[PDB]
Design an enzyme around this catalytic site. Structure first.
Site, mmCIF file in Angstrom:
data_model
loop_
_atom_site.group_PDB
_atom_site.id
_atom_site.type_symbol
_atom_site.label_atom_id
_atom_site.label_comp_id
_atom_site.label_asym_id
_atom_site.label_seq_id
_atom_site.Cartn_x
_atom_site.Cartn_y
_atom_site.Cartn_z
ATOM 1 C CG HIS A 178 33.560 85.737 -2.687
ATOM 2 N ND1 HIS A 178 32.795 84.736 -1.768
ATOM 3 C CD2 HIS A 178 34.595 84.938 -3.226
ATOM 4 C CE1 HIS A 178 33.265 83.694 -2.135
ATOM 5 N NE2 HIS A 178 34.095 83.494 -2.920
ATOM 6 C CD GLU A 179 37.925 86.114 -5.013
ATOM 7 O OE1 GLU A 179 36.900 85.481 -5.076
ATOM 8 O OE2 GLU A 179 39.191 85.570 -4.692
HETATM 9 ZN ZN ZN Z 1 36.503 82.026 -2.978
#
Ligand code: ZN
EC number: 3.4.24.16
Lengths: 6, 665
Positions: free
Chosen positions: B460-461
């Site tokens: 995600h990051e």
């Molecule tokens: Zn985010």
């Protein structure tokens, strides 16, 4: 950015 | 050069507290002179070169020099540097307001747009004009004099309250002491990695690698209750005072600008436009998740009555706030055969990273390589150089800060350090990002093993890292992740789908001892678990979204009682009396104020782009990945969020792919 608090 | 890397990263991390304060005063003077030069020349003297270009050249210089002064407060190991950076952030933030409340700079930008052939400048140049005027009216620059001074006064106070809010959570140090008997069911690799007290007990911190393993594995109810108590009461006293001032100030400034509520003020700059559409999006979503919520709440309660019957504990008949993570883990073990402590054996930190980079050295057509002996802020940080695979163009760089430490950022976010815009000399500046997460650390002689949700956060990051690097614009304010804050989570949540593909996981998986992959039938069990506990997990996110809306639409309400109200009305689990969750809600002070709905709102777009383009024509197809890199990541803030979706999907987005991915209508 950032992310939801798990 | 656009094809070299030497000299393009201008960030220094060896600054001292005295050097930080010195550079803050120097950056203010050298930028004050630029705004004064534009604001001093006559209105009839403005042009594209002395007004628009002059301001555009100082914004890129300011935001890069500002980064070296307001980022050490998140990653440094010296509390004096973290203190000097926080004070430098409070000073530069007030300077941003004084430079934005300028009536002279505003009077010349509006006259420049009128007395200029807009068809002669690039489309991003005129967007820079209309967005600067729009951002000026949102500051009340068209309002009478003393109204502007009252707005500017309240914005400066709101600036200091939000910085102190996150400074309290970042510098928190509250811990708890537990004995061996009180830490039941916890594995020995977790207990042997704790600081032991004089009374032969163990010390537990409130960071993620400690709080979550206790709330998911510890079978002692008293231990889980006292952990949840201390976690949801961090800075309960000092932040409640900050919240009792920050919320009314946002109401008073939103109505001075003509808007109804603060939620209406921030919503018109987002893709959802109106607040009435947000409440309709959250109410209709929780309507479909309500049947799933009743089913999951009934299974957890039955799961608790049997354990209290077996272990001999007292059964209160209710699902308390500390019983949630403990029994959602058991629901994942029983209904899907998933052992998180065993799955992490196949996800060491280096194999996940090597597979994560190789996944995007093929999908997006990039070339990653690590830098040796890189200049970083901490020995645990590694630097990578991003290059285009075909043209060899050095797009950018990014750091990796994957381990928690004292004074470090407690959550897990991405930081845009350098933009990817144009420099005054006409060259393109190399973009720099930074991935800051708090993953598990290597214990018991094993490498750092990651649970599947830690890999989901890693993917995600990294989406924000790719959105930061691939973004190439002309102005600094349109580069990087400077899109709608309810849309910035589209590129990040889009990449979470690669953690749920059987073939993609097979490349990310390698056992840390014999190198054997995950069993074929076990990959199926892990992929099938993408919707376990989806009811309560998403309902709790809707509760946070409603509280985010409620605290900014209705005035004169206790944030603690409003959060507890939406808990028993939506989630079904009552908030523990005394725990002030909004006092720990960092998103309310980190740019997500009134816009927290953007997470679930962005998921509708990422699911629509994944199921209709990627999953339809192979999730590793580079032809689709190149469209995603050029139409979503490359434009950045130079285009509207809905315009980039219409260019990629060639149609209008909908909840079709989003609903069937959740198991709904
Ligand atoms: Zn985010």
């Amino acid at each position: 950015p950032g992310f939801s608090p798990f | 050069s656009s094809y070299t890397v030497a000299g393009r990263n201008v960030l220094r991390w060896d600054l001292s507290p005295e050097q930080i304060k010195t550079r803050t005063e120097e950056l203010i003077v050298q930028t004050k002179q630029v705004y004064d030069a534009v604001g001093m020349l006559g209105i009839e003297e403005v042009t594209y070169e002395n007004c628009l270009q002059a301001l555009a050249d100082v914004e890129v210089k300011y935001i890069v020099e500002r980064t070296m002064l307001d980022f050490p407060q998140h990653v440094s190991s010296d509390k004096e540097v973290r203190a000097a950076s926080t004070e430098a952030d409070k000073r530069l933030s007030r300077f941003d307001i004084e430079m934005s409340m300028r009536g002279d700079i505003f009077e010349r930008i509006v006259h420049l747009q009128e007395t200029c052939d807009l068809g002669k400048i690039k489309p991003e140049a005129r967007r820079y004009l209309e967005k600067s005027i729009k951002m000026g009216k949102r500051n009340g620059l068209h309002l009478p004099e003393q109204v502007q001074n009252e707005i500017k006064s309240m914005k400066k106070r709101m600036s200091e309250l939000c910085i102190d809010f996150n400074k309290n959570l970042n510098e928190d140090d509250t811990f708890l002491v537990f004995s061996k008997a009180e830490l039941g069911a916890l594995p020995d690799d977790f207990i042997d990695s704790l600081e032991k007290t004089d009374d032969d007990k163990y010390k537990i911190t409130l960071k993620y690698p400690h709080y979550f393993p206790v709330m998911k594995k510890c079978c002692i109810p008293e231990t889980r209750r006292r952990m949840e108590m201390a976690f949801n009461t961090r800075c309960k006293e000092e932040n409640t005072i900050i919240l009792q001032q920050l919320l009314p100030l946002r109401t008073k400034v939103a109505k001075l600008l003509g808007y109804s509520t603060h939620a209406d003020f921030v919503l018109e700059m987002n893709t959802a436009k109106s607040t009435s559409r947000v409440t309709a999006f959250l109410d209709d979503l929780s309507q479909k998740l309500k049947p799933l919520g009743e089913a999951e709440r009934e299974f957890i309660l039955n799961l608790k009555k049997k354990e209290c019957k077996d272990r001999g504990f007292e059964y209160d008949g209710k699902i308390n706030a500390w019983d949630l993570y403990y029994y959602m883990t058991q629901t994942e073990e029983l209904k899907y055969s998933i052992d998180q402590e065993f799955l992490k054996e196949y996800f060491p930190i280096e194999v996940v990273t090597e597979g994560l980079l190789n996944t995007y050295q093929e999908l997006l057509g990039l070339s990653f390589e690590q830098m040796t002996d890189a200049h970083v802020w901490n020995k645990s940080v590694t630097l990578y150089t991003v290059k285009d695979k075909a043209t060899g163009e050095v797009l950018g760089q990014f750091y990796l800060d994957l381990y928690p430490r004292e004074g470090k950022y407690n959550h897990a976010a991405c930081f845009g350090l350098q933009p990817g815009c144009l420099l005054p000399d006409g060259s393109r500046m190399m973009a720099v990002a930074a991935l800051v997460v708090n993953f598990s650390q290597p214990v018991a002689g094993r490498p750092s093993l990651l649970r599947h949700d830690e890999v989901r956060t890693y993917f995600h990051e990294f989406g924000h890292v790719m959105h930061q690097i691939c973004a190439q614009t002309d102005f600094a304010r349109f580069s990087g992740t400077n899109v709608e804050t309810d849309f910035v989570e589209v590129p990040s949540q889009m990449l979470e789908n690669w953690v749920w593909d059987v073939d993609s996981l097979r490349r990310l998986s390698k056992h840390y001892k014999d190198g054997s992959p995950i069993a074929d039938d076990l990959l199926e069990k892990l992929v099938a678990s993408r919707l376990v506990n989806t009811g309560l997990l998403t309902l709790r996110q809707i509760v946070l979204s409603k509280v985010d809306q409620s605290l900014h639409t209705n005035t004169s309400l206790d944030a603690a009682s409003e959060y507890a109200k939406y808990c028993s009305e939506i989630l079904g689990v009552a908030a523990t009396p005394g725990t002030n969750m909004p006092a720990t809600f960092g998103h309310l002070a980190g740019g997500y104020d009134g816009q927290y709905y953007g997470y679930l709102w962005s998921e509708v777009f990422s699911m629509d782009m994944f199921y209709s383009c990627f999953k339809k024509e192979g999730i590793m197809n580079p032809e689709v990945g190149m469209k995603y890199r050029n139409l979503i990541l490359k434009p950045g803030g130079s285009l509207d969020g809905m315009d980039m979706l219409h260019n990629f999907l060639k149609r209008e987005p909908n909840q079709k792919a989003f609903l069937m991915s959740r198991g709904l209508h």
